[model samples]
Target chain A: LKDKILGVAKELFIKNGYNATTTGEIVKLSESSKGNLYYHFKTKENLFLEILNIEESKWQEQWKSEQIKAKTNREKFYLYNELSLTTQYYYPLQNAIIEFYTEYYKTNSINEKMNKLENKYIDAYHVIFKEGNLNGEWSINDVNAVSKIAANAVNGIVTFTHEQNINERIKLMNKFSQIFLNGLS
Target chain B: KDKILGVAKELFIKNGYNATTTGEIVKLSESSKGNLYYHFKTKENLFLEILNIEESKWQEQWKSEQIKAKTNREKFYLYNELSLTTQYYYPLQNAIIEFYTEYYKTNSINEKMNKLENKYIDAYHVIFKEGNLNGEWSINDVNAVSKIAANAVNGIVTFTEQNINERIKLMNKFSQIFLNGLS
Candidate 1:
């Protein structure tokens, strides 16, 4: 019953934006009762959070599988971006996630959870930066700083290429990776 | 010409690129359609012209403000901080993004937009080269670093902190990283 509601809600939320999707409609579409929906997710925010958590774990599991195929740290970096761009079944819910964050972020706990999730991705980058430094792919004096900038770089490319096709996305990712691994100067 | 440009500028910024039509521009500007089209060939041309003016105005504003900074390092920080403030291009941001969405797919317009973006990258290049001269940092390819710095700025601007104070802090942190670099 919970999985039924979850799948239905995720589809509705992604197809229409967060602001446009409603718990009422989600219940109707899922063919579930309102009481059951609320019993599982007390609020709409909780439902969205549940979806995000699932997506994050899905991404992590897929990344781990693909990550082992890379022979070098450099290949790993490229694969990270390639997977981020292409692995999603739907258009990544980045815009919907942003809309949801903008609306409910005033909740202190909500804000903390969002920040923690963001830092988790940054930590993933930090691990790669540390390994790359050890393997002589690059020299990093501050893993945190370098990792943060790298996270910013990937996001920047994503932003610019939001309207572009997948080919353009991978092209920009390649250019970004080249510049990122080999110092710009 | 000036009235048409001014009215169109205000309308585009206020209503967004796709929302505001040339006919509406004519109505608001109190000019005939022929006159509006005569001054600027098309709606895209008019918006591009306005963007050209906005970019120049921004550069001029930055130049006068940059003299307040004592060193090139300070100049870079000041530039990034100022870019985030409400004073700078915040109004035209949405309209420009809307315009770029469709037209960026076209090579001619894309090249023009690239040139406009280069103006931004060039500002960073100036500060970076000056800093390199002053022995603040060593840069072999000023161009690449400036482009990367601009990308970092765009990244932060896209996914910035909701709080204004946190946004400014993040901008400063990114600028520091750019100057010192990862290595």
Candidate 2:
């Protein structure tokens, strides 16, 4: 039931700018009825917030967990590049968030909280940077700043559809990780 | 010409690239469709021209700043400073993506766009290579590092464009962060 509402909302939100999209439009197209949307989402505001949460968790939980295969902190970033670019959850996700931020979130009192969303990735990078420093993989000063900028780098690439132009995105990230690590070494 | 392009810019920024109509641009710009189309043959052409003009202006100003700088280390900060000014041009960038989507299969716009992008990479590659010769920072691979570094700035301008004050400080902070990582 929740997935049904989200899938429909995501489509409408992306196609029609958020301000232009309507709850009625979503309900009618989703065919879940007003009752179903309210039972799950509570309000139009909640509906958009719900969509944001759903997309975010796709990053926090599923994509992060995909890192279990990585042998080291550096390897995790390579996995991150592949997942963020080609992976289902992350590619257009940043673009969608940018779309929402500019169009809808501006008036809905969402800017402060949503601004913190990118920080979550920064914090995640903090974890890996710490591990890399501790295990002697590499070293960096001002770990917080390094993580934030690194997070922003990936954020820039995945925010748009650059994977098509830079088909070597995965290779690029792998090579990037090695050079960045070498710099610290 | 200026009045028409100014109004068209706002409309496209407001409605996004493809969603905005040239008809609307004519009506709002208070010009006949003939006059508007005369200045800009089509929406795509108008947008590309706007981007081209803006790019040339920025490159001129940015080149001056680079000339005034003493070393590549200082130039990195200059790079961020110049990048800080690119936030306003983002809608045109978004418009180009819209161009890419509808035209990818049937048009030759991709090469022109790709060629323009490669210029940025080539420009950045020169700066980083210069930095390496100075031994200002330890970069083992110029090609890969330049790609990541250039994309970091491009990404910031691409995604986050509001709150000039916040973005200015954020860009500086991030510039140092990249330096720290590479140092």
Candidate 3:
């Protein structure tokens, strides 16, 4: 019913981060009252998590189908890098997420849910690892480490210097994706 | 000498190189402004000297730690191990990373990081080369593997800055996974 409110909240929260975004601002921007907004979404955290869930599903489902085009294990690895840039394009809150993550990362539910979400991607990539190992050229027994490393490495790419930095991020992402595979999902 | 260098490094790191004033250094370091200028001509010179000092300290630590390696495997292990041991300068390092992207361009900042990253590469290169010669790791292109390992340092910094408690664990994982490429 109040999708408009949540929509405005996502935009406002993106620019302001979790620390600064106010329910009042979100209410005003959406031209709705506090009662109407709360009646539907319950809490700002609830709405925020909902917005994140929406974004995650898009990334996950799209990525699942997209990896189909990755004919070989090598192609799937680069595809993961390309998918990372595309995902970050939508939510560049990574660097800003240190404070945000620390606050929520302590909460047990958010942490558990995140790991569950991660396993999906890791499991998808595990298929490629299994495929690559079948070639007899590699020996990757610890898939969890690769999965975690790629997840961590992929999140670190950023546009700090300029467009040059954006390109730098892509190359780094690509390289790490390859290396992490050499060693997650 | 260490006190002056330490004070200068702290300020330049906490504040940007340009934002930190000479007066603040004099006050904090308990040195006369004239005396400070005597030791270092300008703020830029002072900061650059600190960088040089930091770089040398980095190399010195790596060299000393690496010398204990009796085998190529031990040598390769020490390379990444020492990188973590010398990582107490994280605050300054993190500040400079933000500083480079904000104020300085490709010329000054990139050149500085390139110089810094080369030291990281040099340590990795030496050990990996030794590892290959001794047949610890069958790496044909020591140059290539070392380069990739060096590049992973950036991600390690980025990740470890946020997860400080896991710095050792993450680097250990990184070292293992990195050697996996050579594995």
Query: Which numbered prediction scores highest in DockQ against the true structure?
Result: 2
- What is each predicted model's overall lDDT from 0 to 1? 0.72, 0.67, 0.62
- Residues A63-177 of candidate 1 have per-residue lDDT tens digits of 7788899988878888886676565414647646655654554467676777777777778787787888788776767677666667766765555443336665566567567
TM-score of each: 0.64, 0.77, 0.60
Docking class of 3: incorrect
Per lDDT, the best of the predicted structures is 1
Model 2, stretches more than 4 Å misplaced?
A1-3, A11-25, A32-49, A88-108, A131-143, A160-167, A183-185, B13-15, B18-24, B86-95, B98-102, B129-145, B160-183
Model 1 DockQ class? incorrect
- Which parts of model 3 are misplaced by more than 4 Å? A13-23, A33-48, A85-99, A102-121, A130-139, A153-185, B1-63, B71-73, B82-147, B151-177
lDDT tens readout by residue for model 2, A51-160: 78766776799855787888888887667766766664334444444445544333435556565665776687788889888978776777875676666667665544
lDDT of 1 by residue, B1-183 (tens): 898988887776555665577888788778998897777888899888888888888888998999999998899888888877744454565566556655767888778877787786789889888888888777787775676566567766644436778778767866765555434
CAPRI-wise, candidate 2 is acceptable
User: Clashing residue pairs, candidate 1?
Assistant: none
TM-score of chain B of each: 0.82, 0.82, 0.74
